[PDB]
Amino acid sequence: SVGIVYGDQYRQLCCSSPKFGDRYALVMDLINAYKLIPELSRVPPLQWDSPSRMYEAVTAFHSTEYVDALKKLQMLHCEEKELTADDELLMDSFSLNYDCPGFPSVFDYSLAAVQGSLAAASALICRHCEVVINWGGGWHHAKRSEASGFCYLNDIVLAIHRLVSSQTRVLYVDLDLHHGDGVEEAFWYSPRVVTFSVHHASPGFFPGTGTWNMLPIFLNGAGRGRFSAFNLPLEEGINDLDWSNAIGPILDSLNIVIQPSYVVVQCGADCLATDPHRIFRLTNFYPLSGYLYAIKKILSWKVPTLILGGGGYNFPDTARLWTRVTALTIEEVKGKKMTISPEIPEHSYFSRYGPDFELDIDYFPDSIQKHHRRILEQLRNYADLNKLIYDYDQVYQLY
Ligand SMILES: O=C(NO)c1ccc(Cl)c(NC(=O)c2ccccc2)c1
Numbered sequence: 141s142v143g144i145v146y147g148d149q150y151r152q153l154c155c156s157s158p159k160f161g162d163r164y165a166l167v168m169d170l171i172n173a174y175k176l177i178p179e180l181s182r183v184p185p186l187q188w189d190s191p192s193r194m195y196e197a198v199t200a201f202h203s204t205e206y207v208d209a210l211k212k213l214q215m216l217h218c219e220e221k222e223l224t225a226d227d228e229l230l231m232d233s234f235s236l237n238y239d240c241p242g243f244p245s246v247f248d249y250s251l252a253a254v255q256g257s258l259a260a261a262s263a264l265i266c267r268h269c270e271v272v273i274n275w276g277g278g279w280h281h282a283k284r285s286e287a288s289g290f291c292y293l294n295d296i297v298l299a300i301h302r303l304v305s306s307q308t309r310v311l312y313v314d315l316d317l318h319h320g321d322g323v324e325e326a327f328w329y330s331p332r333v334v335t336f337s338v339h340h341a342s343p344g345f346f347p348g349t350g351t352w353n354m355l356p357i358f359l360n361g362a363g364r365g366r367f368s369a370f371n372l373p374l375e376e377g378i379n380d381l382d383w384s385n386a387i388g389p390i391l392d393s394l395n396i397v398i399q400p401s402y403v404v405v406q407c408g409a410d411c412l413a414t415d416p417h418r419i420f421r422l423t424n425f426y427p428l429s430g431y432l433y434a435i436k437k438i439l440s441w442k443v444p445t446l447i448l449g450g451g452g453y454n455f456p457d458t459a460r461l462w463t464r465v466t467a468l469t470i471e472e473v474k475g476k477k478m479t480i481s482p483e484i485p486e487h488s489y490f491s492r493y494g495p496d497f498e499l500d501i502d503y504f505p506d507s508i509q510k511h512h513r514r515i516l517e518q519l520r521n522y523a524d525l526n527k528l529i530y531d532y533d534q535v536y537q538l539y
Pocket residue numbers: 239281289290316317318346408410416417450451452453
């Protein structure tokens with residue numbers, strides 16, 4: 141069974157932010173318009189017995205002080221009075237400002253994603269679902285005491301922490317345009333959570349990590365976590381095929397060597413050629429979309445898997461992508477063919493898919509070899525540090 145997190149309240153909260161507007165409603169209504177919902181098990185967001193149990197869950201990663209400030213930020217934005225100088229300074233100390241502003245539902249909005257992704261992890265742990273999807277989750281930039289990149293609470297870290305505390309190894313795969321720095325940092329010292337981000341990196345591009353660290357070198361973990369954080373920064377302009385060839389052997393080698401108990405995939409849609417960032421040239425095409433190639437490969441491992449959203453600022457094209465990811469997950473997990481019309485069906489948000497109303501996005505389509513050698517050596521070093529049994533040449537042959 142394939143689970144997916146939704147709910148009426150969940151939907152309201154996921155649609156209450158100024159940056160992401162109603163993207164979540166488009167995604168779930170397009171999934172519904174394509175008649176995928178009856179194939180999927182609804183996973184309800186987690187709710188708690190008391191404020192103390194809620195704090196205990198969230199502060200498994202975040203500091204109490206940051207959680208307190210985030211809740212105060214919501215309360216301050218629910219009254220009319222301007223913030224005081226002291227409250228502005230408090231908020232600045234947690235980077236609750238600039239690109240992570242307050243708004244009337246900021247705490248409930250942020251928490252909802254945590255509630256969704258923790259319930260998703262639970263459904264995998266008890267074996268109710270083989271795969272769970274949460275298109276309201278994936279907020280990989282939030283840090284223990286710092287908002288970042290419109291990420292206020294890191295639902296991924298909390299879900300992964302629940303998975304590993306259930307020996308258990310989690311492989312985290314971050315397909316977002318941006319480096320998954322918050323998840324990487326949370327598990328920097330943990331060999332049991334191997335993180336892998338593929339992303340654009342270049343001078344001045346957010347958040348600035350996931351690349352050569354200023355012959356400069358790649359940091360990759362520390363302590364017993366040495367060699368356990370993997371990164372693949374890519375030049376702008378990369379298409380589906382090159383991105384797929386870049387990531388494919390890495391994914392397979394990580395699975396062979398790490399043998400994860402769970403995979404967690406962030407599927408940020410900002411690599412689409414039609415995303416406003418206009419950096420990568422990925423598509424949602426399915427004859428091949430780099431996203432669908434990656435997800436199909438990961439699912440072919442038959443490891444219990446969490447699929448999360450993330451970036452994606454062209455809301456209809458993010459819906460078009462994540463609808464195909466959802467249909468692909470059903471087909472791969474259940475072995476049951478999913479036929480998706482190339483035309484958007486009529487539904488609530490039909491007009492948002494103008495002017496053509498097609499499921500395809502509207503787009504006419506040595507460095508990587510050096511990163512592969514680097515990553516293969518790091519993986520050898522990770523296996524050597526952690527005394528993992530594996531065939532070197534089977535792994536080497538993948539590349
Ligand atoms: O997706 C993000 N993190 O995974 C993310 C993190 C930091 C920033 Cl600054 C942004 N920026 C945008 O969303 C954006 C940029 C150009 C046009 C329209 C929107 C996104």
